[PDB]
Amino acid sequence: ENLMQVYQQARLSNPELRKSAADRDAAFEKINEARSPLLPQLGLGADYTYSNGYRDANGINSNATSASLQLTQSIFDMSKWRALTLQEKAAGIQDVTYQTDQQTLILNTATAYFNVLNAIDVLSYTQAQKEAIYRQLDQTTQRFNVGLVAITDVQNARAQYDTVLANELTARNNLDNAVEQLRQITGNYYPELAALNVENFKTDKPQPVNALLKEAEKRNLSLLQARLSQDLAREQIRQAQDGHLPTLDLTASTGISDTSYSGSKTRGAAGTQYDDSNMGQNKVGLSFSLPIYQGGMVNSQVKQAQYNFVGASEQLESAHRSVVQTVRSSFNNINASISSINAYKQAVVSAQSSLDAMEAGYSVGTRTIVDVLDATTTLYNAKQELANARYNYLINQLNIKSALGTLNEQDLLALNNALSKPVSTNPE
Amino acid sequence: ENLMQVYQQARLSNPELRKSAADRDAAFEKINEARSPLLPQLGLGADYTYSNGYRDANGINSNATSASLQLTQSIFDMSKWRALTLQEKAAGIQDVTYQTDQQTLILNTATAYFNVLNAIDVLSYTQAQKEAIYRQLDQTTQRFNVGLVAITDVQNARAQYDTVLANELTARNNLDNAVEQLRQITGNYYPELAALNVENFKTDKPQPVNALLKEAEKRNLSLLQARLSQDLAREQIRQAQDGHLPTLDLTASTGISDTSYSGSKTRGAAGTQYDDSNMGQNKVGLSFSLPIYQGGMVNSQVKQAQYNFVGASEQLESAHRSVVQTVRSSFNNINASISSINAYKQAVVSAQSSLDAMEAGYSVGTRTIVDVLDATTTLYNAKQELANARYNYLINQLNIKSALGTLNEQDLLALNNALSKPVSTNPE
Amino acid sequence: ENLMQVYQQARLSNPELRKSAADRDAAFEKINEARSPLLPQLGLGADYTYSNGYRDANGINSNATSASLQLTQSIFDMSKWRALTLQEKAAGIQDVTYQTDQQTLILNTATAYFNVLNAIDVLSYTQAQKEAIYRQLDQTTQRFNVGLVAITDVQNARAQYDTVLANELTARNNLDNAVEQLRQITGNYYPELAALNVENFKTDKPQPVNALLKEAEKRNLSLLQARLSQDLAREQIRQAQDGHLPTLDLTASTGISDTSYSGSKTRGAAGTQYDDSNMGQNKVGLSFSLPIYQGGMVNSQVKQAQYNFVGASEQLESAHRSVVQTVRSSFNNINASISSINAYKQAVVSAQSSLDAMEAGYSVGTRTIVDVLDATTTLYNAKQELANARYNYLINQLNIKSALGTLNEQDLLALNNALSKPVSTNPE
C-alpha cells in the first residue's frame, strides 16, 4: 500500500487519462480521413424520367431510363496535402497534451497519498488535546464542589471541552474526506497506508538554477506545444496562398441507356431520324480551371493568416517567460522547505525538554498531572507540524522535477526508501 | 419582506434564469428546422439569355428566355432522421441545465439573504466594542492628567480607539455591500428583513448515508446530463454508419421558353429548322444513387465515433465518482455544523455568567465601569458566533438537498417558518 | 527607474497587448473579405474528352477540346450587405476589447511596482527582528552558563532564533519572485525603483457616489461591449429574414473549340451528320430565383434569431447591474483605505514614543539593550504597515479610475510625482 502500488493501479483506472488517450486516438485516426479524398471515388447513378411536352410540342410523349458509373481522380491540387500536414501537426499537439496529463496524474496521486497521512497525524494530536482538556475540567469541577473556585470557571472549562470535541469531529470528517479523495483518484478504498520512515530522511540539495533553466528550455511540455502551434500557424499561412494554384481532375464514366421512340406522329415517313438506337457511352476526359480575379478574397485571407501567425508568436513569447518564472519559483520553494524543516526540527527538540521536565516534577511531586498532559499535547503539536513539513518537502521536489518535465515513474527509489510499516487510515 | 417573498420576486425578476429559459426555447425551436428537410421544397426560376457565338456562324442572332418551377421531395434517407433524434437529445440536455439553473438561483438567494443578518450582528457588536474602548481611553487620559501614568500609555489607548473606528467603518461598508449584492439578484432594495426566531429553532438528525446515495443515483441532475450525452454519442455513432446506405429522390418541373431569332439572312429557304419556337415541357422523374468506394471517409468516421463514445463513457464515470464524493462531503458538513452550534451555545452561557459576575461586583463597588463594558462586548461577540453558526446549518441543509437533486420551493418554505421578526437593514 | 519609464517600456514590449493589437488588425481585415463577393468574378474551364460507342454502336468517335472564360456578378442580394454590417460590428467589439486590455496593463504595472517596494520594506523589518532575537539568545546562553536558568530556556531561545532564520529566507525568496514577476510584464531587470516621498502624499476626498455612477454609465467598457453585442444580435435577426427574399445575378462567357473527327467505319451514309465542325458560344443573360413551401426552413430560422436577441438583451441587463455593484464597492474601498491609513499613523507615533522611553531608560542605566532592540523591531513593523497602507490607497484610486472607464497614461503621470528617492532592490 505504498505510493508505487497505489500509482500502478491509478495508471490503469484513472478516467482523466483515459479520456486523454481517447482524444489522442481520435486525433491520430483522423489523418486517414484526410488522405481519403486524394484516392479515386466510385458511385452509381441509376434514375428514371417521364415527360409531356406542351405549348408548341403538343401531343409528344416520352419516357427515359439511364444508369451509369463515375470515377474522379485528382491529379494536382496541393490543397489536400496541406490538410495532411496540418492534421499531423494537430496529432503532435494532442500527444503533447497526453504527456502533460500523465505527469498531472502522477502528481495528484502523490499529493492525495500524503494528505491522508497528514490527516491521521492531526487526528492523533486532537485526541491528545481532548484528553488534557477533559482532565482540566475534572480538576476544576472537583475544586469547585470542594470550594476554592467560582462557577464561572466551571463553565469556562466546559466551553473548552466542547470546543475540543468539535475539533475532534472535524478531524474525523477530514480523515474520511481525504480517503474519499484517495478513492476518487485511484478508484479503490485503502484501509492501510505506509508512512514515512523518519530515521532515514534525506534533506538533499538542488542543482544550480541556470542548469535547470537550460533543461527546461530544452524539454518542457508547455513551450513545446507552443512551438507546435507556431509551426501550425506557418503551415496555415502556406495553405492560404494555395488558393491561386490551378487545379485539374481526371474523370471517366461509363453506362448504358436503351431509349425507344413511339407515337402516331413518329410512325410513318420517319426518315431514319426517329429510329431507335442501342449505343453506349464510355466517356473519359480531364478538366482544368483557375481563378483570375476573385475580387481579392485570397489576397485578404493571406493577410488574415499573417496576423494569426504574429499573434501565435506573441503567445509563444509569453509562454517562454512563464516557464522561466515558474522554474525560478520552484527552486526557491525547495530552499524554503529546507529552511522550514530545520526550524521545525529545532522546535521539536525544544518541546521534548519541557515534557521531560514536567514528568520529573510529577515523579518527585512538584507538579500535577495536568501539566504533564498539556506538555504531551504540545509535543504532539511539534510532531504533527514536522511531519507536515517533510511531506511538503517531498511534494515540492516532485513539483520542481515536474517543471523540468522529466518525471513519469523514475520516482521509484525516491519514495521506496521513504516508506515504513503500514498505518491504518480509518481506525475503529 | 422575508425569505419566501424575496425568492418569489427573484423567480421571475432574475435575468440569469430567464437567459436559461431563452436557451431552452432556442433548443426546442431547433427541432423545427431539423424536420424541415423532410417536407417538399417547392421553388421558382426565370432566366433570359442573349447569344451571338460566331466561331463559324457570323451574323446569327438568337435570344433566349425561360421560366419554370421546381419541386423536390426526398424518399429514403437516414441522414435526416438521425438529425431529428440528435436535436431532440440536445433539447433534453438544455432542459437539464435549466433545472440546474433553477436550483442555483434558490441557493444564491438564500445565501444573499443570510449575509445581511450576519452584517447586522457584526455591526452591533463592533459598535459595542467602540463604546468600551472609548471609555477606556477616557479613563486613561484622566489618569495621565491626574499624574499616575505616563504619556506612553495614552498613545496606546488612542491607537486602539482609531483601530476600532476603522473596524466599525469596515463593518458598515460590508453591510452596504451585502445589501447591494442582494439587489443584484432581485433588482430591488429591501429596507428591512426578517430575522431568525431563536426560541423556535430545530436541530434534526440527517438520514442514513446509504439512502442519500440511492436517491442521488436516482435523481442527480449532472448524472442525467452525463447519461444523455452518452446516448447522444451512441446515436451519432449510428448516424455515421448511415453514410453508406443509398438515397432516393423525386423531382418535377414545368416551364416555358421563347428562343426567338432575327435577321433577314436567316429568313428564306431556311428549311423550317431556324424558325422561332414556343415550346413547353413538363418533365418529371426520380434520381437514385448508392456509393461504392469513397476511401477512408466511410471507414474513419466510424472509428472516430467509437472513440468519442468511449470518451463519453469516461466522462460519465467521472460524474459518478464526483457525485458520490459530494454527497458524502455535504453529509459530513451537516454534523460539523451541529457540533459547532453546541460549542458556541456553551460559549454564550459562559460569557453570560462572566457578565453577571462583573455587574454584581460593580454594583457592590469592587469593579470600575470600564470592566463592565468589556464583559458586555465579550457577550455581544459571542452572539456573532452563535448567529453565524445557525445560518451555516441552514445553508448546509439547503446544499445537501441540492446534491440529492430534490431542492424545490417546498424545501425552501420550511426555512421561512423560523424567520418571524422584522429588522432594519440600516440602523439610524 | 521610475514608474513612468517602466510603463513606457512595458507598453511597447508587452506581448499580451500586442496580441490584442494583432487581433484587432486581423478583425478589421475581415471587412475586405466581407465585400469581396459583391465584386465581379472570373475563371476558366478548359478541358478535353474522348467518347466511344459500343454494343453494336462501334465505329463512331468524337473528340472534345473546350476553353472558355466566365464572368459572374450579382446585382441584387440583401444577404451580402448583412455580412458587411456584422463585420463592422465585430470591428467595434475588437476595438472595445483592445481598450480594456490597455487599462489592465496599466493596473498590472502599478501593482508590480508597489509589490516590489513592499517586499523591500518587509525584508528590512525581518532583518531587524533577526538581530533582536540573536541578542536575546546570547543573553540567555550567558545566563545559563553563569547558572541562573535551565536548559529548557536555551532550547526555547534556539527555537525562536531558528524560526526567524526561516522567515528571513522566505522574505528574500518573495523579493526575487516579485522582481521576476515584474520582469514578466516589463521584460527587464530593474536593480532600483523610486521610493515614496512622504512629504507630499495626497489623501483627497472622492466625489459623490451618484455622480460617479452616472459618469461610469457613459464611458465604461464592459457595458459598451454589451450594447454592441445586442446591436449585432439585431443585425443577426435582420440577416435571417432576408433568406426568403428574391435575388438576381448576371452571367457572361465566351469560348471556342475544334470538333474534327476521324475513323474508317464512320464513313458511309453519313448524311452530312458526321462532318467536322468548329463552333463558339457567347451566351450572356440574367437570372432570378424566389423560394416557396420550403417546410419553413428559414421561417423557423427567424424564431432562433429572436430568442438569441432576447438573451443578448438579458445579458446586457446583467452587465448593467454588475457595473452598479462594482463601482459602489470600489468607492467603499477607497474610504476604508483612508481610515486604515489614519490608524497606522497613530500606531507609528505610539511605537516611536515607546522606543524613546526605552532608549532613555537604557541611557540612564535602568534597562538592558534587548529592550532597545525589541522597541526598534516594533517601530519597523509599524513603518512597514503604514507603507503598505499608502501603496494600497494609491492602487485603489487607480482601480476606481479604471472602473469609471477613464484610465490612461496621463492619469498615471500625476502619481509619478509621489516617487522621488531611488532604492536598491538587492542592496550589497
Distances in Å between the Cα of C166 and the Cα atoms of A349, B69, C171, C346 are: 17, 88, 9, 31
Please tell me if residue C152 touches chain A, with a CB cutoff of 8 Å.
yes
Distance CA(C372)–CA(B113), nearest Å, equals 52
Please tell me if residue B360 touches chain A, with a CB cutoff of 8 Å.
no
Asked if B33 and C301 come within 8 Å (Cβ–Cβ), the reply is: yes
B and C: number of Cβ contacts within 8 A: 166
Please tell me if residue A340 touches chain C, with a CB cutoff of 8 Å.
yes
Nearest residue of B to residue C281, measured between CA atoms: B53
Q: Which residues are bridge partners to C44 per DSSP? A: C69
Distance CA(A391)–CA(A372), nearest Å, equals 29
User: Cβ(A403)–Cβ(A326) under 8 Å?
Assistant: yes
**Coil, strand, or helix at residue A42?**
strand
Distance CA(C26)–CA(C20), nearest Å, equals 10
> Cell for B81?
432522421
Asked if A282 and C22 come within 8 Å (Cβ–Cβ), the reply is: no
Within 10 A of C427 (CB to CB), how many other CB atoms are there? 10
Contacts of residue B122, Cβ cutoff 8 Å, sequence gap at least 6: B171, B174, B175, B384
**Coil, strand, or helix at residue C49?**
strand
Q: Which residues are bridge partners to B65 per DSSP? A: B48
Chains in contact with C, where contact requires at least 3 CB pairs less than 8 Å apart: A, B
> Cell for B106?
434558490
Count the domains in chain C: 1
Distance CA(A233)–CA(A219), nearest Å, equals 22
Q: Which of C106, C114, C194 is nearest to C423 (CA)?
A: C194
In the PDB record, what is the listed experimental method?
Answer: cryo-EM
Distance CA(A6)–CA(B363), nearest Å, equals 68
Nearest to C26 among A304, A321, A325 (CB): A304
Contacts of residue A256, Cβ cutoff 8 Å, sequence gap at least 6: A66, A67, A68, A280, A281, C55
Buried residues in C131-141 as b, exposed as e (16+ CB within 10 A): ebbebbbeebe
Closest chain A C-alpha to B277 CA, distance in angstroms: 7
Owner of C-alpha cell 491528545: A128
Domain span at C198: 1-428
Residues 293-332 of A with CB under 8 A from C: 293-297, 300-301, 303-304, 307-308, 310-311, 314-315, 317-318, 321-322, 324-325, 328-329, 332
- List chain B residues with CB under 8 Å of A177: 328-329, 332
Nearest to A47 among B286, B321, B336 (CB): B286
Please tell me if residue B177 touches chain C, with a CB cutoff of 8 Å.
yes
Distance CA(A128)–CA(A422), nearest Å, equals 22
Asked if C42 and A307 come within 8 Å (Cβ–Cβ), the reply is: no
User: Cβ(B303)–Cβ(A31) under 8 Å?
Assistant: no
- Supply the Cα-derived Rg of chain A in whole angstroms: 40
Helical spans, DSSP H, in A261-368: 297-364
Closest chain A C-alpha to B314 CA, distance in angstroms: 5
Q: What is the dihedral of CA C248, C252, C258, C264, to 10 degrees?
A: 10
Nearest to A170 among B296, B301, B336 (CB): B336
3-state secondary structure B79-144: HHHHHHHHHHHHHHHHHHHHHHHHHHHHHHHHHHHHHHHHHHHHHHHHHHHHHHHHHHHHHHHHHH
- CB half-sphere exposure, B222, CA atoms < 13 A: 16
Distance CA(C401)–CA(C411), nearest Å, equals 9
Distances in Å between the Cα of A212 and the Cα atoms of A227, A405, C254 are: 20, 11, 70
Amino acid letter, A410: Q
Q: Which of A382, A364, A383, A361 is nearest to A372 (CA)?
A: A361
User: Cβ(B34)–Cβ(C301) under 8 Å?
Assistant: no
User: Cβ(B90)–Cβ(B232) under 8 Å?
Assistant: yes
Amino acid letter, C57: A
Distance CA(C253)–CA(C263), nearest Å, equals 33
Please tell me if residue B287 touches chain C, with a CB cutoff of 8 Å.
no
Amino acid letter, A374: D
Distance CA(B314)–CA(B233), nearest Å, equals 12
Q: Which of A204, A186, A203, A202 is nearest to A4 (CA)?
A: A186
Closest chain C C-alpha to A209 CA, distance in angstroms: 13
Resolution stated for this PDB structure, in Å:
3.1
Element (H, E) at C295: none
Query: What DSSP state is assigned to residue C14?
Result: -
Closest chain A C-alpha to B312 CA, distance in angstroms: 8
> Cell for B13?
425578476
Nearest to C304 among B30, B48, B151 (CB): B30
- List chain A residues with CB under 8 Å of B331: none
Q: Which of A178, A175, A156 is nearest to A167 (CA)?
A: A175
Asked if A41 and B307 come within 8 Å (Cβ–Cβ), the reply is: no
Distances in Å between the Cα of B367 and the Cα atoms of A322, A356, B361, B362 are: 63, 42, 6, 5
Residues A55, A59, A65, A71: is their CA dihedral positive or negative?
Answer: negative
Distances in Å between the Cα of A361 and the Cα atoms of A122, A123, A368, B348, C148 are: 28, 29, 8, 37, 19
**Secondary structure E strands in C22-109:** 41-44, 47-50, 63-76
Asked if B183 and C321 come within 8 Å (Cβ–Cβ), the reply is: yes
Owner of C-alpha cell 494583432: C22
Distance CA(A110)–CA(A107), nearest Å, equals 5
User: Cβ(B10)–Cβ(B185) under 8 Å?
Assistant: yes
**Secondary structure E strands in B200-246:** none
Distance CA(A126)–CA(A131), nearest Å, equals 9
Helical spans, DSSP H, in A147-290: 151-185, 209-219, 221-240
Query: What DSSP state is assigned to residue A420?
Result: -
- Give the CATH number of the domain where residue C358 resides: 1.20.1600.10
Please tell me if residue A8 touches chain B, with a CB cutoff of 8 Å.
no
Q: Which residues are bridge partners to A66 per DSSP? A: A47
The number of helix segments (H) and strand segments (E) in chain A equals: 9, 9
Distance CA(C328)–CA(C209), nearest Å, equals 7
